[PDB]
Amino acid sequence: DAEFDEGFKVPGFLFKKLFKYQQTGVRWLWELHCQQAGGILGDEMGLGRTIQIIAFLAGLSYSKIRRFEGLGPTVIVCPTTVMHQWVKEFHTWWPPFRVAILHETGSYTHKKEKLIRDVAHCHGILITSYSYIRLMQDDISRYDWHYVILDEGHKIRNPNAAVTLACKQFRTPHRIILSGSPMQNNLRELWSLFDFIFPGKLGTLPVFMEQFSVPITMGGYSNASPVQVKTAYKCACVLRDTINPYLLRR
Amino acid sequence: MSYNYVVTAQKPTAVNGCVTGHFTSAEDLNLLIAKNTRLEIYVVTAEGLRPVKEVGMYGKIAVMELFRPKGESKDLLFILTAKYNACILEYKQSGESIDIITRAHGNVQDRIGRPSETGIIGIIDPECRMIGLRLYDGLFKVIPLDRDNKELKAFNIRLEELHVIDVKFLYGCQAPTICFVYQDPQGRHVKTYEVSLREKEFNKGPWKQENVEAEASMVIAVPEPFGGAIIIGQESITYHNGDKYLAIAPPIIKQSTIVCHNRVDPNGSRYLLGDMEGRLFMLLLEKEEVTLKDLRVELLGETSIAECLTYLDNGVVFVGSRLGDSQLVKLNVDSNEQGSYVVAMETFTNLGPIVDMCVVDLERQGQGQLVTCSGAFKEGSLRIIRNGIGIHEHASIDLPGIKGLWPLRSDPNRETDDTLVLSFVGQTRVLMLNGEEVEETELMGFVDDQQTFFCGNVAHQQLIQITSASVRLVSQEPKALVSEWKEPQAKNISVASCNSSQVVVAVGRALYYLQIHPQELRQISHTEMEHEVACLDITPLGDSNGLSPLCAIGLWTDISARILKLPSFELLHKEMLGGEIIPRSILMTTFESSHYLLCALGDGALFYFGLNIETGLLSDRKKVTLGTQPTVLRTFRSLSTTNVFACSDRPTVIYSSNHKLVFSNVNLKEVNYMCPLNSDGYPDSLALANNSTLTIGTIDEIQKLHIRTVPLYESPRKICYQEVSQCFGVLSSRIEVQGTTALRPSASTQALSSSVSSSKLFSEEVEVHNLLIIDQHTFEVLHAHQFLQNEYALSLVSCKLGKDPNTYFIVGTAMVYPEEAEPKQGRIVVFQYSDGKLQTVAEKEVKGAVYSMVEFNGKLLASINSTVRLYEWTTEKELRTECNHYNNIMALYLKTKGDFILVGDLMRSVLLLAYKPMEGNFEEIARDFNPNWMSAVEILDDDNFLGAENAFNLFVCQKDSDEERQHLQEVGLFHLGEFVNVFCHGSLVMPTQGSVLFGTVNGMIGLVTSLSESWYNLLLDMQNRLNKVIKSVGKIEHSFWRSFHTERKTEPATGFIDGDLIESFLDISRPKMQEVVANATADDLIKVVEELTRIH
Amino acid sequence: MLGFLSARQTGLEDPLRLRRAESTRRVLGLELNKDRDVERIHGGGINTLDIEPVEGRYMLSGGSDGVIVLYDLENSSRQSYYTCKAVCSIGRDHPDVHRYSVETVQWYPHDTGMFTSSSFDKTLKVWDTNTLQTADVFNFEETVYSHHMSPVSTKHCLVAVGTRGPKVQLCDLKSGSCSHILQGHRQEILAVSWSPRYDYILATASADSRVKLWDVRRASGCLITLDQHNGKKSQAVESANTAHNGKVNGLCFTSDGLHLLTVGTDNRMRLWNSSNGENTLVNYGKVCNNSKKGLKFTVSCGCSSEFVFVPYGSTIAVYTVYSGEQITMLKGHYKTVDCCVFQSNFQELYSGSRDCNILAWVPSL
DNA sequence: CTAGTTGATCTCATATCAGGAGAAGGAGCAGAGCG
């Protein structure tokens, strides 16, 4: 087995299948769990962000870390295309977990709320889509989720979209975003992602814009004075330093 | 930077903790004794204790408990150090090799925390599921064992009670259940908690909190049949098992508090209880069929004041004392007709709390000799410690004026010399010495009419006797003389010499060579020297053929220990010496390496040489002075090698250790002559004559520190030596109860004469203080002056003041009343000891406690409560103030060197004061602004000030190089682990500069001395190497152990070399040395470390 | 006492006894030393004092006039009487002086080379002690009522800042990131204090009568809200769980960090278990404060018994922490007392006050 | 029953001079108590 600080043992066979960077990832995710903070797995796509989550959750359940005796009920929000992909992935890389799909396709064939309750009681891994999160913020946000992974989490990049608010209604600190590109147009998107994972780190949205987005943007324009270039440089470095612990971008 | 070398002259002797168990083997019963830093392992034999291993911890052993985890064959040892190094030790013996492997270790010091008042508690679950440590207020550290650690990861449980007195794990509980007494404003209560290693928090205990006696200070977990706990308070002993509440108030335990206990049985039907008075009680649990019926306390007797006591077996109890000698007592079934069942079997020397000490060159030698105020209330005593060979005086016979001693095997078969010969003036008197019996019976062939310069056993199964007239070679078995030679002119032999094979005898200014042949004496060589012979030696050494090759000669008027080639009497070398004194003895011997010559003059000077077997040329001339009387040198062969003895006013054994010539002292008054003897009744013994009698004995030759004990039976406080009067003045203190009554006959109450202070100045149990004048030969209390009622004698100096010639005992006192926290009143009393009486020559009412007085350039420098003032001795013989100094919290310690005064404060730590005589006032020169609470202080150099803080640290301050020049710089830091009570210049012996001894509370005597920069660098390098090589018991780092440590500061050591660690460089095998000495050769460093060990 | 010296000398008692007991005895004897003075440099009241945690030699002092004075507390003169001379001073002419009242000032723990000071000009300025130039300036949108750097964090170097805003700002001095906010209070935060035991626990007290302890590492809001009654009056937490019945304008963890003392304008002090915020019900009686801003009070360290020294109007009231007994009230100021700081080496207390004086209280004899 | 298709139907994302009269406030200031 592989052992980390307090009680985290991930099975050795599982660990050996991983790469070195994926192992680093698993360690990073567990350090966050210790802090009770969230993070963004900003690995460039194709590196296999999902494999790292599988390993980490597997290790956490296996270690039976101490409300919850190891891994509680958890929800995975991922784009509609990849739900069965994630189901497949859990099934191969760790059969023991129950991975219920929440979708019209699904596998339940009853009312959905019964399925939500079932997973929240039997401590499964409820996969769902951003739509069903937007549409059942009421039902879903009544069950003490342990982990709230968002795959391709950039879809929460609009702080005012409904889906964003719904995703930010979840209460647990163990929020994770798996987003190959956690910033696509401007930093407002970044702030939004951080406000899901770590609600206070970057401040309020107005303050973030005032302090970071404006200066960092103005330093990119061709006509910007060198002074403003250097303010942008400063602010950019501050931002990287602020977000360093909580973003793992290989 | 300062370069200081600290070493242990006497390891700590105070037993701070002892446990029993099966540590070295499942069948052995071990007694593990923690003396402050030493762990001593014994085996509990049917008689006494057999030492097996003594290890040095890098820590003060705060906790020491044996526990046996499931499946383990034999007990593992848990030790917690004062710096909170935890370790679990196992004993692994592999044949001759013995190891203490560290099964686990760690550091459990919380970064922050109020260290608990009552002190570090360490308990172990009776089922070894956890080690509970109470280190800080409000927290309870748990070290799991079921989770088998190697790093001892421990977690705190928050304890809702912040003042915990004592705590124990209860027996017969499915969960680890602690029972502790804690103090809240509403009184003292006993509470229980269950420890959950899974939930890592407490739970409700089996039986709820109970309001107990006000002074409950002890919890005793009682084994499974009864369960429950027994809480000992001052006036009651109560038993709790949850519903049962037995309670007794035995009137006999009201007089003193019970401080230690031990479970005699495995089932807890009997406990020992030791009190601070030294009584020993037996607490009996009467079972009823099982529950507990009733409690009984019975007084077994008295012991030393026990810190810890352990019951070994068969009534043998080890009483481990911090205040007095530790004891091995027996508990008799029947009383001793004095009401006591305790009978002391053995006593282990304990230099107890060394509260003061002085170095006196008593016996007028060149050797210092510590006299220490050791021990406490009932165990107080003076210890005299010295370094010298010790021998037993078995066979004595008082024949005046011996002038000869030789071992003779009168039984020809045996190679033991069962006959002793002595020449007195003009005859020979022999001794049969048969067995241990001694009587004078005559062996044929030797004359009772002539002096004998020599006799002894020689080859061809022959004896030889050289007389003042002529030589006599006796055939041993058959009959008397068949060979005689005499001088042709019949001149008396003036100087002789002889060995087993040949003979060399001087006749005035000419010399004669004879050699022995069986039943014949053949003369060969002759010479005519310039002047008369003074001394000879012809001893064959490394002979390997049968005859010595060389000889040495000392001559008159040409003072020179010259060398001769034996077959020719010719001059091989002629080396002058100087002086008008004829050499009186000359010898050559081997010390492990080659032939040396030892020639001495009449005044104890003695020259050792490297003699060659081919040239026999004298070089490597170096001198040593030993005694004042003319000398004589005769060898005895030990187990190991030749060990030469010198006979004079100061008898000294001569020998070489690690190829280094040592000059040990022997602790006997005088020895005229010596001779080896190895009789059937006497093996390898000595035969030492004085002017009166023939003393006989044997020498251990271990060069151990010898410790005399003078029982005072009361707490000594100070001691000073008044040489002019031949006495020691000792401040003593005895406890009286009622007006008052002495609880026991103390040394003060048993003096020859006595007196009480009648002073016109000032007009349960109390402390009475006396000034004891003690004879410096017999150590009898010549006089005991009691001080005023409620007067505490604190300081005491012997000195002569001003210009008058009388040497005075000056005592500074304080008036102690319970109505106040700091004395407002006190006085400086001047005594003179003369004509066996102690007259009060002067007095001076001061307005505070006189904590310290040093005689300072003809003047008395006293330190009243916060003021340092200087007194002058006026022609009228009274003390008159000259100057004051007030910038002190409490001037507790005063030292002096020239015009400078070092003041150790209660908590401002040092102040360098100067008495500028031109003005007549003090000047604050420098000050150390760190808050160190001093325990003692010393002045090493003009600008180096040794200090000891009450946190067991040594620091050296240094006057730096503006107003930052008034800042002493702490250039030396070192954690001693001992509480220094006293420093004093001096040395216990005849590279390093200066020598400061110190005495500690645990009984350590250490030695600080100044090094040069080069040697300090070298020794620091080797210190790091040894740390890289030597492995400590609990895997503690030496640098961490010696790091300066305080509750509000922690810095690494610097400017101090652990002389213990360096001197450990000898006790490692050669490959390990090479590991040490990678980057000069090893033998260089062996020489270095030997020379370093030479200082103590 | 000579009993104490004799006990130390003979090993009857651990030397820890004599320190701690004597330390206590010294604390009980605190008396206004007229044999010690502090040089007057503030034109306005002293809001804050801070003795440096290592070596305790220097004190910083922040005034209502905006100046920061740096005093040397060692008696370098040979007399028994001395004035703690002022080494440096951020005076009216310094280019970087605060514009309005300095409200807090703090030595960087771990090193005397840098201190920090925050003001009503809405800035927290970090200063190089040696050159006495600002190394950094954090600007806040609201006036700063207090800040505090962790006495224990070898790892993080966050400054917690309480302003009139309802949010707690954490300012990272390592790359300067003043974005992180703890949100959950509702009115100005009048006092913040890091735990002396735990690296990342912060307690913050606010005018909404609530005190919250935070694990700033944690992304999930307060750990604990202190509740006066421990549950006797229990409500779904929207307005209940008030620590006090007024504003809570003071916090101080006890030395070992196991309890928290809060003072608020209901004229009470409470002692709270800092692990579960439970109320220990220590009484302490009536402690007058009506300060509208933070009240800076301390605890003793290294005594047999812990004491808390609280400004009580124009006096410093000394209380025993764990029993509540009022030891004494030290009476020597003329106007209200704003701050008292404890010198742990020698059991000396310095207290500033609105009358522009800093009085030293040193044990008598 | 089950995929497949097909509308709706939602969400989210993309970008730079010949007026006059009267009423209300404020400012300046004399002066009167008055503490």
XYZ file of C-alpha atoms in Angstrom, chain A:
250
model
C 0.000 0.000 0.000
C 0.840 3.688 -0.201
C 0.592 5.740 2.969
C 0.153 9.448 3.584
C 0.030 11.614 6.626
C -2.749 10.738 8.983
C -4.577 7.642 7.947
C -4.691 7.653 4.213
C -3.817 4.285 2.758
C -4.640 3.734 -0.891
C -4.342 0.122 -2.121
C -0.984 -0.638 -3.623
C -2.301 -2.199 -6.790
C -4.400 0.844 -7.430
C -1.444 3.094 -6.663
C 0.853 1.208 -9.009
C -1.582 1.599 -11.869
C -1.307 5.361 -11.437
C 1.429 7.527 -12.845
C 3.717 9.700 -10.793
C 1.712 12.815 -11.481
C -1.555 11.057 -10.717
C -0.066 9.943 -7.467
C 0.893 13.499 -6.697
C -2.643 14.407 -7.446
C -4.027 11.886 -5.035
C -1.820 13.240 -2.361
C -2.897 16.787 -3.140
C -6.536 15.915 -2.995
C -6.056 14.277 0.323
C -4.161 17.228 1.728
C -7.121 19.343 0.737
C -9.437 16.944 2.465
C -7.388 17.452 5.538
C -7.651 21.197 5.244
C -11.348 20.804 4.398
C -10.910 22.915 1.306
C -11.728 22.371 -2.310
C -9.642 22.522 -5.369
C -9.529 22.614 -9.103
C -7.872 19.780 -10.952
C -6.738 21.833 -13.836
C -4.715 19.133 -15.511
C -4.611 19.526 -19.250
C -7.155 17.193 -20.753
C -6.101 13.722 -21.739
C -3.846 13.413 -18.717
C -6.795 11.687 -17.060
C -8.279 13.870 -14.332
C -10.990 11.307 -13.570
C -8.515 8.522 -12.767
C -7.103 10.650 -9.973
C -10.506 11.156 -8.445
C -11.193 7.470 -8.607
C -7.975 6.700 -6.840
C -8.461 9.288 -4.181
C -12.019 8.411 -3.322
C -11.133 4.750 -3.357
C -8.310 5.331 -0.949
C -10.507 7.419 1.272
C -13.202 4.794 1.471
C -10.680 2.038 1.986
C -8.897 3.866 4.750
C -12.202 4.303 6.572
C -11.254 7.762 7.779
C -13.295 9.169 10.617
C -20.178 11.696 11.275
C -18.870 9.651 8.359
C -17.081 6.320 8.541
C -14.865 6.914 5.537
C -16.628 8.135 2.392
C -20.152 9.453 2.785
C -22.680 9.950 0.024
C -21.181 11.928 -2.810
C -22.471 13.624 -5.931
C -20.746 13.904 -9.286
C -21.977 16.552 -11.661
C -20.637 16.066 -15.135
C -21.722 17.016 -18.612
C -24.435 14.858 -20.045
C -22.169 13.141 -22.498
C -19.833 11.565 -20.012
C -22.053 10.176 -17.328
C -21.869 6.600 -18.398
C -18.204 7.119 -18.995
C -17.768 7.921 -15.327
C -19.920 4.989 -14.369
C -17.709 2.757 -16.433
C -14.658 4.248 -14.838
C -15.777 3.678 -11.295
C -16.834 0.182 -12.182
C -13.500 -0.846 -13.566
C -11.023 1.032 -11.362
C -13.014 0.286 -8.196
C -15.995 -2.064 -8.304
C -17.081 -1.758 -4.664
C -18.772 1.664 -4.919
C -22.378 1.969 -5.956
C -22.544 4.587 -8.695
C -26.111 5.583 -9.330
C -26.903 7.604 -12.440
C -29.491 10.362 -12.159
C -30.895 10.815 -15.626
C -33.798 10.092 -17.871
C -31.732 7.208 -19.161
C -30.546 6.182 -15.731
C -31.120 2.726 -14.359
C -33.626 3.323 -11.569
C -36.974 3.515 -13.337
C -38.840 5.045 -10.403
C -39.174 8.508 -8.970
C -35.812 10.208 -8.746
C -36.153 11.476 -5.201
C -36.269 7.900 -4.022
C -32.912 7.475 -5.717
C -31.521 10.570 -4.075
C -32.599 9.257 -0.716
C -31.240 5.821 -1.502
C -27.815 7.099 -2.305
C -27.784 9.486 0.633
C -28.661 6.585 2.936
C -26.563 3.762 1.474
C -23.672 6.144 0.744
C -23.249 5.685 -2.973
C -21.811 7.940 -5.622
C -24.617 9.794 -7.332
C -23.619 10.909 -10.812
C -25.737 13.656 -12.292
C -25.763 16.428 -14.849
C -25.703 20.114 -14.440
C -29.315 20.309 -15.494
C -30.641 17.973 -12.898
C -28.623 19.990 -10.415
C -30.258 23.185 -11.528
C -33.691 21.621 -11.440
C -33.465 19.863 -8.062
C -31.562 22.230 -5.903
C -34.324 21.638 -3.422
C -34.267 17.860 -3.346
C -30.572 17.367 -3.750
C -29.548 19.953 -1.181
C -31.120 18.161 1.732
C -28.819 15.203 2.279
C -25.408 16.072 3.702
C -23.258 15.219 0.741
C -19.700 14.373 1.487
C -18.115 15.275 -1.842
C -19.434 17.425 -4.610
C -17.163 16.824 -7.585
C -18.018 18.829 -10.708
C -16.518 17.446 -13.847
C -15.798 19.963 -16.512
C -16.586 22.341 -13.873
C -16.059 25.357 -15.976
C -19.766 25.304 -16.675
C -20.106 27.074 -13.354
C -18.098 29.883 -14.765
C -20.987 32.285 -14.789
C -21.578 33.390 -11.267
C -25.156 34.230 -11.993
C -26.278 31.318 -14.003
C -28.856 29.239 -12.281
C -26.670 26.227 -12.405
C -23.954 28.130 -10.695
C -26.110 29.133 -7.824
C -27.464 25.652 -7.502
C -24.005 24.214 -7.361
C -23.024 26.744 -4.764
C -25.863 25.721 -2.524
C -24.039 22.546 -1.516
C -22.732 22.695 2.006
C -19.767 20.417 2.336
C -16.267 21.822 2.103
C -15.124 19.030 -0.097
C -15.940 20.593 -3.370
C -13.808 19.649 -6.354
C -13.734 20.948 -9.933
C -12.177 18.976 -12.701
C -11.706 21.505 -15.439
C -9.145 21.294 -18.161
C -9.423 25.061 -18.572
C -10.591 26.890 -15.552
C -10.517 30.196 -17.277
C -11.634 30.897 -20.673
C -12.576 34.472 -21.235
C -11.753 36.586 -18.235
C -11.080 36.239 -14.619
C -14.694 36.607 -13.628
C -14.785 33.008 -14.629
C -11.933 32.231 -12.340
C -13.554 33.903 -9.387
C -16.632 31.964 -9.999
C -14.797 28.686 -9.930
C -12.997 29.592 -6.779
C -16.133 30.698 -5.155
C -17.469 27.267 -5.584
C -14.476 25.464 -4.318
C -13.388 27.923 -1.670
C -16.031 30.527 -1.030
C -13.924 33.195 0.525
C -10.452 32.990 -0.906
C -10.804 35.502 -3.642
C -13.026 37.995 -2.028
C -16.411 39.144 -3.151
C -16.934 39.420 -6.868
C -16.906 43.184 -6.943
C -13.760 43.323 -4.959
C -12.135 40.690 -7.085
C -12.872 42.568 -10.223
C -11.705 45.832 -8.738
C -8.472 44.381 -7.419
C -7.578 41.730 -9.970
C -9.577 41.693 -13.123
C -9.188 45.297 -14.032
C -5.454 45.527 -13.503
C -4.637 42.186 -14.921
C -6.642 42.907 -17.987
C -5.225 46.343 -18.563
C -1.790 44.949 -18.659
C -2.525 42.974 -21.775
C -3.580 45.703 -24.091
C -1.061 46.945 -26.596
C -1.426 50.584 -25.652
C -1.131 50.079 -21.900
C 1.458 52.201 -20.213
C 4.382 50.335 -18.698
C 3.282 51.337 -15.227
C 0.081 49.543 -15.774
C 1.969 46.623 -17.202
C 3.789 46.306 -13.935
C 0.656 46.590 -11.887
C -0.750 43.801 -13.925
C 2.366 41.814 -13.352
C 2.141 42.303 -9.646
C -1.492 41.431 -9.445
C -1.041 38.403 -11.591
C 1.649 37.093 -9.348
C -0.463 37.721 -6.290
C -3.256 35.845 -7.879
C -1.120 32.892 -8.699
C 0.122 32.829 -5.193
C -3.346 33.004 -3.839
C -4.589 30.213 -6.022
C -1.549 28.012 -5.928
C -2.606 25.578 -3.249
C -6.027 25.007 -4.638
C -5.275 24.530 -8.303
C -3.279 21.528 -9.549
C -2.566 22.310 -13.161
C -0.077 19.998 -14.838
